[PDB]
Amino acid sequence: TTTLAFRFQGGIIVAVDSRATAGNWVASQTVKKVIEINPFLLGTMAGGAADCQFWETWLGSQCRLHELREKERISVAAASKILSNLVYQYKGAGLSMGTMICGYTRKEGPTIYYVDSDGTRLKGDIFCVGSGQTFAYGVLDSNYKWDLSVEDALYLGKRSILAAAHRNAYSGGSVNLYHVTEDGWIYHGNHDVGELFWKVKEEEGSFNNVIG
Amino acid sequence: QFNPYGDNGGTILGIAGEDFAVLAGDTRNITDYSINSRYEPKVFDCGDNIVMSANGFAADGDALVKRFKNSVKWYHFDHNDKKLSINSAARNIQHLLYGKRFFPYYVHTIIAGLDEDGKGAVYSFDPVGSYEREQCRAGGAAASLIMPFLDNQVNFKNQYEPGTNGKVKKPLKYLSVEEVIKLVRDSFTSATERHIQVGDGLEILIVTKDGVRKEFYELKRD
Amino acid sequence: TSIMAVTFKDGVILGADSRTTTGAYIANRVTDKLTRVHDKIWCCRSGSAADTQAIADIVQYHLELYTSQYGTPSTETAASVFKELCYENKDNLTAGIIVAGYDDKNKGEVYTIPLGGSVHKLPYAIAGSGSTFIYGYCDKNFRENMSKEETVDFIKHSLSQAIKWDGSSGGVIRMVVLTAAGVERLIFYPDEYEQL
Amino acid sequence: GYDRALSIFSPDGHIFQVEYALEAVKRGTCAVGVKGKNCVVLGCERRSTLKLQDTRITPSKVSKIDSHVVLSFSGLNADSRILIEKARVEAQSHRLTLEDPVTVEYLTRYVAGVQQRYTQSGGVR
Amino acid sequence: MDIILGIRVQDSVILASSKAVTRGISVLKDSDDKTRQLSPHTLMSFAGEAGDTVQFAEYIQANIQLYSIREDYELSPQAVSSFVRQELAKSIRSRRPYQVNVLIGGYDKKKNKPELYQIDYLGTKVELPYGAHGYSGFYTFSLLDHHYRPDMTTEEGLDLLKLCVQELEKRMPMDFKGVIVKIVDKDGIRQVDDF
Amino acid sequence: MDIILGIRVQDSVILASSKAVTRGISVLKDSDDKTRQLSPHTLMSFAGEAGDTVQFAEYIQANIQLYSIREDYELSPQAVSSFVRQELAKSIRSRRPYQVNVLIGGYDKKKNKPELYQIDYLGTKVELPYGAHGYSGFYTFSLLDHHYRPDMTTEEGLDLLKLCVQELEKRMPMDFKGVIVKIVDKDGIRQVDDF
Amino acid sequence: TTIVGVKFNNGVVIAADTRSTQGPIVADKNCAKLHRISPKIWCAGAGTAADTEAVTQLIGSNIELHSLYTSREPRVVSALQMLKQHLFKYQGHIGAYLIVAGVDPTGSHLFSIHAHGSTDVGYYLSLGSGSLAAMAVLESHWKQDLTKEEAIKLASDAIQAGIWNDLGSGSNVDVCVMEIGKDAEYLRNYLTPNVREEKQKSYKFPRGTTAVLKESIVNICD
Amino acid sequence: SDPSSINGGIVVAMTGKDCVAIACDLRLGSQSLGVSNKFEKIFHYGHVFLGITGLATDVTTLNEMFRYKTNLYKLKEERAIEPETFTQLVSSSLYERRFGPYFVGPVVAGINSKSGKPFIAGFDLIGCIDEAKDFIVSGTASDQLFGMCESLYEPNLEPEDLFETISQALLNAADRDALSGWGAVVYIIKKDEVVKRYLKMRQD
Amino acid sequence: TQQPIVTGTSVISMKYDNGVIIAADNLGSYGSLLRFNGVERLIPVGDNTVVGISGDISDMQHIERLLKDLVTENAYDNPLADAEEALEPSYIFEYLATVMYQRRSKMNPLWNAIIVAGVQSNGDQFLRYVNLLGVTYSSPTLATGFGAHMANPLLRKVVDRESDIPKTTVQVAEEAIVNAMRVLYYRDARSSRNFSLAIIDKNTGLTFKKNLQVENMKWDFAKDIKGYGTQKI
Numbered sequence A: 001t002t003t004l005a006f007r008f009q010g011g012i013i014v015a016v017d018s019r020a021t022a023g024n025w026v027a028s029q030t031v032k033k034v035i036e037i038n039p040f041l042l043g044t045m046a047g048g049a050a051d052c053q054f055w056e057t058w059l060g061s062q063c064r065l066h067e068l069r070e071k072e073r074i075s076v077a078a079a080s081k082i083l084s085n086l087v088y089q090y091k092g093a094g095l096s097m098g099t100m101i102c103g104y105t106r107k108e109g110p111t112i113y114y115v116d117s118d119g120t121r122l123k124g125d126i127f128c129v130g131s132g133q134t135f136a137y138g139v140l141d142s143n144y145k146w147d148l149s150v151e152d153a154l155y156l157g158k159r160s161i162l163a164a165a166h167r168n169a170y171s172g173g174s175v176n177l178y179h180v181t182e183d184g185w186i187y188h189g190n191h192d193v194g195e196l197f198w199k200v201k202e203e204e205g206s207f208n209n210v211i212g
Numbered sequence B: 001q002f003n004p005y006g007d008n009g010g011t012i013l014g015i016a017g018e019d020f021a022v023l024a025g026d027t028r029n030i031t032d033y034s035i036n037s038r039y040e041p042k043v044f045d046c047g048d049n050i051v052m053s054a055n056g057f058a059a060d061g062d063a064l065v066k067r068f069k070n071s072v073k074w075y076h077f078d079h080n081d082k083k084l085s086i087n088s089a090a091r092n093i094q095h096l097l098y099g100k101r102f103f104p105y106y107v108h109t110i111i112a113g114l115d116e117d118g119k120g121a122v123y124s125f126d127p128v129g130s131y132e133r134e135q136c137r138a139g140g141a142a143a144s145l146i147m148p149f150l151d152n153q154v155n156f157k158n159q160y161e162p163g164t165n166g167k168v169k170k171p172l173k174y175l176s177v178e179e180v181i182k183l184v185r186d187s188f189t190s191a192t193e194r195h196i197q198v199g200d201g202l203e204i205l206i207v208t209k210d211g212v213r214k215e216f217y218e219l220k221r222d
Numbered sequence C: 001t002s003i004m005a006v007t008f009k010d011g012v013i014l015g016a017d018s019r020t021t022t023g024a025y026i027a028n029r030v031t032d033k034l035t036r037v038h039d040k041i042w043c044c045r046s047g048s049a050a051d052t053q054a055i056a057d058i059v060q061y062h063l064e065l066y067t068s069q070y071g072t073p074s075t076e077t078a079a080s081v082f083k084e085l086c087y088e089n090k091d092n093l094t095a096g097i098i099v100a101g102y103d104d105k106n107k108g109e110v111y112t113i114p115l116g117g118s119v120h121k122l123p124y125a126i127a128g129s130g131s132t133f134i135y136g137y138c139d140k141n142f143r144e145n146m147s148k149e150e151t152v153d154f155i156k157h158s159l160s161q162a163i164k165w166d167g168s169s170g171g172v173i174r175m176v177v178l179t180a181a182g183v184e185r186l187i188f189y190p191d192e193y194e195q196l
Numbered sequence D: 001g002y003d004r005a006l007s008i009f010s011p012d013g014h015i016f017q018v019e020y021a022l023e024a025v026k027r028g029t030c031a032v033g034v035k036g037k038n039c040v041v042l043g044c045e046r047r048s049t050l051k052l053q054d055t056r057i058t059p060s061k062v063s064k065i066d067s068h069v070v071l072s073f074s075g076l077n078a079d080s081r082i083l084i085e086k087a088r089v090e091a092q093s094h095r096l097t098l099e100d101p102v103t104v105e106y107l108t109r110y111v112a113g114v115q116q117r118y119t120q121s122g123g124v125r
Numbered sequence E, F: 001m002d003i004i005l006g007i008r009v010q011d012s013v014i015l016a017s018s019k020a021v022t023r024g025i026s027v028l029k030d031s032d033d034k035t036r037q038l039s040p041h042t043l044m045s046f047a048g049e050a051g052d053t054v055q056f057a058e059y060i061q062a063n064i065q066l067y068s069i070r071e072d073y074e075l076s077p078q079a080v081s082s083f084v085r086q087e088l089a090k091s092i093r094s095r096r097p098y099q100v101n102v103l104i105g106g107y108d109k110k111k112n113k114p115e116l117y118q119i120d121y122l123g124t125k126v127e128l129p130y131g132a133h134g135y136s137g138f139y140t141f142s143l144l145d146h147h148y149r150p151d152m153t154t155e156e157g158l159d160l161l162k163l164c165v166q167e168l169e170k171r172m173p174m175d176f177k178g179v180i181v182k183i184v185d186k187d188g189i190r191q192v193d194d195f
Numbered sequence G: 001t002t003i004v005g006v007k008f009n010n011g012v013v014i015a016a017d018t019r020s021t022q023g024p025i026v027a028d029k030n031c032a033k034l035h036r037i038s039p040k041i042w043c044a045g046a047g048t049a050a051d052t053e054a055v056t057q058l059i060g061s062n063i064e065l066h067s068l069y070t071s072r073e074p075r076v077v078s079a080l081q082m083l084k085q086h087l088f089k090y091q092g093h094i095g096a097y098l099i100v101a102g103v104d105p106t107g108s109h110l111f112s113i114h115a116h117g118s119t120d121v122g123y124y125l126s127l128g129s130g131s132l133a134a135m136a137v138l139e140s141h142w143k144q145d146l147t148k149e150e151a152i153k154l155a156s157d158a159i160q161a162g163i164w165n166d167l168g169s170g171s172n173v174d175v176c177v178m179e180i181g182k183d184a185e186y187l188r189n190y191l192t193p194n195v196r197e198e199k200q201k202s203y204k205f206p207r208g209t210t211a212v213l214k215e216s217i218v219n220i221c222d
Numbered sequence H: 001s002d003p004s005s006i007n008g009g010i011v012v013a014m015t016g017k018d019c020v021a022i023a024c025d026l027r028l029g030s031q032s033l034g035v036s037n038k039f040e041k042i043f044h045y046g047h048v049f050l051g052i053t054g055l056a057t058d059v060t061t062l063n064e065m066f067r068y069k070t071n072l073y074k075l076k077e078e079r080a081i082e083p084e085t086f087t088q089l090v091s092s093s094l095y096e097r098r099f100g101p102y103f104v105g106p107v108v109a110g111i112n113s114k115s116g117k118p119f120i121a122g123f124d125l126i127g128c129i130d131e132a133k134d135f136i137v138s139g140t141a142s143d144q145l146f147g148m149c150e151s152l153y154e155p156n157l158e159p160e161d162l163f164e165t166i167s168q169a170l171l172n173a174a175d176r177d178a179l180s181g182w183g184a185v186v187y188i189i190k191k192d193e194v195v196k197r198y199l200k201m202r203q204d
Numbered sequence I: 001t002q003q004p005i006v007t008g009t010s011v012i013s014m015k016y017d018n019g020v021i022i023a024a025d026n027l028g029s030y031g032s033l034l035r036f037n038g039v040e041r042l043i044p045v046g047d048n049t050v051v052g053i054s055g056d057i058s059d060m061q062h063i064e065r066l067l068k069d070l071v072t073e074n075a076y077d078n079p080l081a082d083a084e085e086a087l088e089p090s091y092i093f094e095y096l097a098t099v100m101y102q103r104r105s106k107m108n109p110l111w112n113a114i115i116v117a118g119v120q121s122n123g124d125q126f127l128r129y130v131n132l133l134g135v136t137y138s139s140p141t142l143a144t145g146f147g148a149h150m151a152n153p154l155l156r157k158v159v160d161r162e163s164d165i166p167k168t169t170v171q172v173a174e175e176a177i178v179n180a181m182r183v184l185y186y187r188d189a190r191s192s193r194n195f196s197l198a199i200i201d202k203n204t205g206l207t208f209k210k211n212l213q214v215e216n217m218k219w220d221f222a223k224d225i226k227g228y229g230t231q232k233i
């Protein structure tokens, strides 16, 4: 896996790949690594597929119970802490989860929380998670500015996953894009690396290491 | 030291059509280099037009199928004989599998049937409950042999339209039940040739709105 | 294996079962564990089949070369050559060998050579996994200067019991008789010895 | 454990133990709450049959549950301490998990839920 | 988590804590505040195993805040440090111990004195003029042995602290991304924004 | 030893190598040059096991210099890289292998082309437009995949290299104390003093 | 592997299956496990495939040189002695398990050799993963004074038992008959009871399906 | 630390009607890190073609070794080595290192210049010859290649059809393996002409 | 977590046209020591089922007691205990299969391999296997231990598939079983000559044969075998 999410002028970009592996065996190229918790909350998945999938859908149930009891949408901080406190109870049991809880509320604004299986919970503007995180960081950091447009930010997130999809063997398949605003999250499509790579290579003039 | 797991071999295969779905599996059961049975079915009709197979360690496989079948029964009791949809069955199975997260069922599970729009559906599970709906999935010992062939023939991967300079992809389309059974049979004969744990017999369960039909074919017994 | 060699009035008799195992599988049920290293010097082989064969072959070569130069070797000499191989290569060998021969001067002699490569001259010797079960029986029943028929019955009854209790022993009971008369091979089948 | 159902229904549909608990409140010293445009004021009566009191150390009638919420009461003084303690613990627990202090409605709902639990739990009044 | 330092001077306690949060070959964050305010005049920094550090710090924070509300009174730094030590002393013989090392810098209002306590994950408490956890101490202790004086001002303490950070930035293998510095005195707790 | 980078551009090869030498919890040196000139137009950088790195580099240097004197002729970068690979290929099946990874940047005077070879301790050789050894590659490869162009100038290559070092200084856990940059072109080898 | 050897009236016959495995994968469906040491001394090999081939070729080479040196036809005991002393020297690390058979001026012979260098004599022998299945047949049907045609039948039946019941063995049955006074006859693919059935579909692709980036003529000439 | 699956890669060979095809991927990596997308695994000595998968240093070393040996062969024999003979040379050379082997999966392909017969062969790391009428597979996606070849292959394919079959076998197998792919090359070999084609595949 | 101490070897069985046959030797081994010789490893349940057990004998005796108690429990408040509501082979098997899997799931297995042979009330043949792992399977021929490797190949030559069952008589089927027991005596080092054999027929019912012996053995050829290669004497 490679996943990322970064905060900018126009909200939050979230981008993930879709590959799933069992050792060197490519088991799937069409996995959904973004969980839609509610119209204002997203969750990213990296590590153990079952661990991430099971517990983040469980998180969505807990976030729903909150707004029934409190007649108010759960904060991104409170949502992320439910998950971090949960995995902390299991610490040492062997859970493998690298997640990011991304969303918008009135009191917080656009917010991203990194949450992993050994109990780490961090608020921040930029995170990349998964085995291909470093490859995404390389492209993302070197092109990141706060004043990116929604169009340029969407592309940078997409291009960063593509970079990791290319170099990291355990990342690939397709890119899933999301944009989180004050009005909620907006899906920006599934982009197959099979076509995207050559399209990006030709139009951008990058990837000169590859035989054109 | 006592090892609670074993490998019973065999391989399974699920393909989804437009208004149907098939779930196939070989009938060979093995341990190490010995054949236990040439005909031991591991693809089951679980009711509500859901077929299921849990391939790998047969004891865990049988336990899981048994528990799911029971889950279907109690779903009827508790919810006024409501039909368990394939998507609801899939989520239920995730909880069965993840319930034993720290002492897993050593199986690859596949279920097949029709979704609530009447379209063919195949769901596949890892041992601890991560699941995904797909048009296509092979599971078990010969999955690594069969799956890439399915990518090529069912989902038309790496196939481009002739003369288009590798620019236009071969268009996706649903396969007929006749064409799907051809791919299943050729997949299993190919797997039988090159994998020692696969052979003896092939049992296919076909699911349509009319019900669950069965077909059986001989495979090489060496 | 169950093996033994017994001196008696006219010379010496070697005895053995015929079972060779790989774990609990019987790789050979008609094995010949009694092997010639010289005309009237033979041995019983127990332990690793490969090691005991390799050793016996080398000893046979040594005694053949001895005979070409110095004439017929003594049974003691043969036991010394076995010992030398077993002792000097003790780290890499799993061989329990009983050496038995007939001289005209010394008559019947038995030497046993356990794992360590030590040598022990005895009136009779037992060895192999099945021998454990017949120490009591053999000690109580052995007598010196027995006749041929008495010694054959002693070995037959002894190996019969060893075979009965030891899973690693079985098949036929082979025997080799060493006397001034010559060399005689004997065989005894389950239907006879089992119901003793 | 002591299991007796003390709070139970009567023929006319009343739970006398709950209603007798109200009589204990009616006996207690008067407490008043008035909320203005930008404030709330909690007034409390203290009976004057007790002279030679030490007002420095005597438990105050109004208690802080958190830095932003207060609780006054009428009725059994010993009983109030148990509710106040539970409320204070829940206030810190809320800050720990939600990363935000309790709302006044939430804190009230919690305290009210504790009171209710003691009206249909065995062995308690 | 790696570098946490503490210096007690004449009228205050100064805590310096590294900003880096590293996992594997990636610095995930470079602005992490490795401290919690336990009470208006008591501050605790922490370092150790991921997850455990924050979980422990906040657990202590909740307990001290609960005490403050109950008694309408602030516990002394000595009292808080003894409470923290006991929790760690319980923890070390638990099924899964808290692998967390802490410094507790506080200003005792009754004594009008600053106090610095160093407590490791075993529950080993010591009151010190200056303290450090992890590999930091292997450089800073000898440095402070030389340059530290007991009658120093807060400003002198900050210069003394700069000398420690410079040495660590020169000789430490890992990039810890600078430090957040906080001062604890009679007026409470405040953060130095430019360090 | 940790970070060594290489970028081949239009008319030159640029090697960047970290200056830190760390042993334990101490940075022993912050001005270490992790490279040797094998010939006037061939430069080799190296990283790996302590002792092995320099011993191997100088051994290769001696052999190439011996060849140059014997034939009064400079070996091509391709020829030198093949010689180096074979030595490492011998080494990996020795009693104690050289645990050294190298980049060989050279300018072929007969072809008038810059050439960059990446060789690991196993004797795995590849010619590349840009290369890296160790954890550096996990950041720089994807970065260069995006920003690199084959027709870039030496100055553009240096800016591209600055972009790599900045990213490494941001996200790498360890402080590698900057890099020494050297350029290999038709005029030979020279060092950039201000980076 | 399944390999066997059976003695008869005027000679000896050996046989073998033709499956070569690589883990659970069938690498070669029709490999030759019968090896010629000399014209009338043949060898069936089980275990490590490279070792059986290498050791049989080496001893075969030295046997030929020995035959030329001594102006005599080679003997089975010479091959046996050379093989076992070689295998013993390597302490089982050369994983060759061999059934050595042949005819020579002394007569007809049948031996087995194991990797550690031990040898056995018999009228019927079996080695390999399917040796137990084969030996079961040999123990059930073998008798003294077999004819040529009876021994071939018994040997091939013993191999078949391995083919069907042992997952390590499969495909075809090779046989070599060594009779006294006659040339040895090597019967490659004596039985072929595992022919692949006709595929359901032809997977011949339309020309131009594969996307191509470059073409070039390769120079093989000088 | 499994030598055969550090760098990754695959080779496949097929026979057709009076022709042979040999193909390989272009990836060279270090476990998860993709390093090179130009690393070809097929070499040729005269008209004999050799593909080699496995540990990349040994791929390079063996190429250089067989170039060495086939060059001396040609000088002494005064003719080019044939596929059948070369296959024996490969087997001998690999088995020479029996207890310290090259971690490789070589594949020989070619047409005998005298008889005109198409020839392919495969080996394990210690030199066991695996001869085949139909196809040989090797590398980290060997399971996948076995599955693709066994289903897609049919005998007596024409060079143009054989190209499509071998290409689709390689591509779809590589896409199910993390350590294989990143480009591909296909050699179509006729009696006296050889065509080399680079395939377009997904680059992840 | 266990290790087996006193053990029983192969249990072999097969279906024939009217019923099933099952057999097992009378040995209780103690490692390589052939310790106990009067051990019955076939245990009848009612007049329609025989449970053959191999592996740990202490656990076998535990299973005997469970089956014995199952018959008692089934008779309670059951007027049709010897008729319509009598214990079926399928009931007995499923019970054991449940226990075996529960025990393996608690990491404390019954260290056995079990074959339940019998005839159902409707006349159908029942033959099914279960072991310490809770693994279950059915086949026209079933065998445990060495029997799986050596007996099955021989028994499958008689009944190779379902359609061969009606063509196989009790005479032919018993002959194959007895032959298989001889082969096991030749080749299994933890086997004995003495064994028991049970036939459950839908017409003639349960026939339990005790104190059978392996006979008609070939050993004569052993006399001709001399040395291990060269040796002529």
Ligand SMILES: *[C@@](C)(CO)[C@](*)(O)[C@H](CC(C)C)NC(=O)[C@H](Cc1ccccc1)NC(=O)[C@H](CC(C)C)NC(=O)[C@H](CCc1ccccc1)NC(=O)CN1CCOCC1
Pocket: A001, A002, A019, A020, A021, A022, A023, A025, A027, A028, A031, A033, A045, A046, A047, A048, A049, A050, A052, A096, A130, A131, A170, A171, B101, B104, B126, B127, B128, B130
């Ligand atoms: C990238 C790919 C790097 O991993 C991403 O992180 C993705 C994340 C997405 C899918 C959420 N991660 C994976 O693909 C993840 C990698 C992984 C594997 C194992 C442990 C941790 C991380 N893959 C999986 O989890 C796979 C997903 C399946 C293939 C859909 N699952 C497995 O490998 C499973 C179960 C793992 C497991 C966890 C805890 C306890 C027990 C098992 N294992 C198998 O399927 C076993 N095996 C695979 C090969 O076939 C035989 C059976």
Ligand SMILES: *[C@@](C)(CO)[C@](*)(O)[C@H](CC(C)C)NC(=O)[C@H](Cc1ccccc1)NC(=O)[C@H](CC(C)C)NC(=O)[C@H](CCc1ccccc1)NC(=O)CN1CCOCC1
Pocket: C001, C002, C019, C020, C021, C022, C023, C027, C031, C033, C045, C046, C047, C048, C049, C050, C051, C052, C094, C128, C129, C130, C168, C169, G114, G116, G118
């Ligand atoms: C009785 C049986 C015991 O005292 C006798 O002594 C006989 C003596 C006769 C043969 C001269 N001994 C054996 O039968 C002997 C027992 C034995 C086994 C292992 C070590 C020492 C003694 N059996 C053998 O030697 C067989 C002969 C084969 C079957 C023809 N060989 C083996 O079992 C080999 C030996 C390897 C070895 C181990 C230790 C020292 C020397 C050699 N072992 C195996 O093949 C292992 N087996 C292979 C399959 O996987 C399961 C284990």
Ligand SMILES: *[C@@](C)(CO)[C@](*)(O)[C@H](CC(C)C)NC(=O)[C@H](Cc1ccccc1)NC(=O)[C@H](CC(C)C)NC(=O)[C@H](CCc1ccccc1)NC(=O)CN1CCOCC1
Pocket: G001, G002, G019, G020, G021, G022, G023, G027, G031, G033, G045, G046, G047, G048, G049, G050, G052, G095, G128, G129, G168, G169, H004, H054, H103, H104, H105, H123, H124, H125, H126, H128, H129, H130
């Ligand atoms: C039956 C089928 C099995 O018992 C027979 O015994 C046959 C004998 C006939 C063919 C002579 N045996 C095999 O088929 C034999 C089984 C085997 C496997 C492994 C160890 C021992 C025996 N198969 C082989 O020997 C294959 C032959 C190839 C497929 C043609 N070889 C391998 O599987 C090699 C193992 C080589 C080896 C080295 C050192 C010690 C023992 C064996 N394995 C590989 O090639 C795997 N690897 C893949 C990636 O690149 C590096 C190599």
Ligand SMILES: [Cl-]
Pocket: C020, C031, C032, C033, C049, C053, G118, G119, I228
């Ligand atoms: Cl022997």
Ligand SMILES: [Mg+2]
Pocket: A164, A165, A166, A167, A168, A169, A170, A171, A172, H203, H204
């Ligand atoms: Mg990738």
Ligand SMILES: [Mg+2]
Pocket: B221, B222, G162, G163, G164, G165, G166, G167, G168, G169, G170
């Ligand atoms: Mg088979």
